[PDB]
Design a protein around this nucleic acid. Structure first.
Length: 128
RNA sequence: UUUAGAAGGAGAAGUCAUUUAAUAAGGCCACUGUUAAAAAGUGUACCGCCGGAUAGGCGG
């Protein structure tokens, strides 16, 4: 579905936009291929929000002091910011570094759409 | 109690061949360097005698 949604129609706009519009062009296109179009659209537009329910050895877990007690933070990285920053730094003169480490297979198994698009992100060079 | 904790990046190799950088030219004019210092520091040692004496002591 992450590939399906990312396709561009004849006007160059995403299937996401045409689904949100329920555009007659997309309805006509899909109904020529399947009768399930209404259920596909409803499922895509009604995807649940990802909720944390557990933790693992692999998530970075960090103690932070609060009033002499310590809370146990679990740090989640942000993909929307990583895509946005990697985009905006591609078009600016700021001192920047490109991380080029993820393979395509590794990026795919992160399971994100944006990480598959943004496998080699640009990032700020915060150096002395 | 720290985006915690972990890590072998590695082997090998012909860069070669050739070449007009030339032509020309006013750097000139003016100018107050200036007053005042103990070279000190005994620079330095000498010649014998006792002692197997390299050790360690002596007179002048």
């Amino acid at each position: 579905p992450q590939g399906f949604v990312a396709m561009e129609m004849s006007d160059g706009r995403t299937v996401m936009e045409h689904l949100q519009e329920d555009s007659a062009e997309l309805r006509h296109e899909m109904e020529e291929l399947t009768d399930k179009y209404d259920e596909i659209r409803d499922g895509i537009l009604n995807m649940p929000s990802m909720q944390p329910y557990r933790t693992n050895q692999f998530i970075k877990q960090v103690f932070f002091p609060v009033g002499g007690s310590y809370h146990l933070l679990s740090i989640l990285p942000s993909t929307v910011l990583n895509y946005e920053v990697s985009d905006r730094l591609y078009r600016s003169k700021i001192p920047k570094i490109r991380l080029r480490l993820l393979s395509s297979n590794a990026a795919s198994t992160t399971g994100s759409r944006l990480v598959s698009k943004n496998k080699w992100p640009l990032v700020f060079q915060a150096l002395p």
